[model samples]
Target: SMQEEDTFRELRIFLRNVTHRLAIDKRFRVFTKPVDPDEVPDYVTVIKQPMDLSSVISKIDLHKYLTVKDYLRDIDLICSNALEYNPDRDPGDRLIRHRACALRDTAYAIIKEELDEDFEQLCEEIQESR
Candidate 1:
């Protein structure tokens, strides 16, 4: 369960960092409107610098941790969820898409050379448990 513990720990940090970034970023806006498409209309949008997973990477000590694979997975999931909540489908949609893509690439770079077989298996088990 060490791997899961590590994963959860890293995830806590990741989410914290992400939430901090959201608070500072002007472009990242929360949708306060109702879910109804017509009555509430679309949620408000903002513009700010894209999130950099590298910032989160710098906060953790990789030497103490066995792998960043779970961290990367969590980052991907967060970015994907952001995209899902995006209300924009205009030509500028590429901006949001590109930022999500950038986050994925950064995550890959962070975990590229690192591999944890046990972590992988644990992740699979976690998914199955869900």
Candidate 2:
């Protein structure tokens, strides 16, 4: 559905307006990482459900969950026939997807390698903390 929308009217304009507003927030930054000395840099990752803060402040945190190998396959069947739709994949999209998956997989592997935790205790501790 996104590809069907007007590029200038919706996609581009929506991004510009939202960025302008978010740029004003004192806690927000366009780049959390330091600049690279290489070529131009113009990319951002939206983080959601941050677990570090203990303040009562409220904010809308956005994030992208990942698409698994199975998800890619399963979507084919899901997209087969809807009332009106098209599944379009961009070429550059996977570069980020794979990177996200790779990073998460390694982090998970590190946790799994240890594989030692009180399943119920950890859950209850976490639940009580919130």
User: What TM-score would each prediction reach against the true structure?
Assistant: 0.37, 0.29
Q: Give candidate 2's whole-model lDDT.
A: 0.28
Model 2 alpha-carbon drift over 4 Å, by segment: 1-88, 119-123, 126-130
Q: Top model by lDDT, which number? A: 1
Among these predictions, the greatest TM-score belongs to: 1
lDDT of 2 by residue, 1-130 (tens): 3322232133234323333433343332312122233532331121121111111011112211111222123222222211012123554444434433443344345434532345323433433554
**Residue lDDT tens for model 1, 24-88:** 54443321112333642443233222233344444343422233454555456546655765648
- Report lDDT (CA) for all predictions: 0.48, 0.28
What's model 2's lDDT at 53?
Answer: 13
Instruction: Give me the displacement of residue 11 in model 1, in angstroms.
Output: 13
lDDT of 1: 0.48
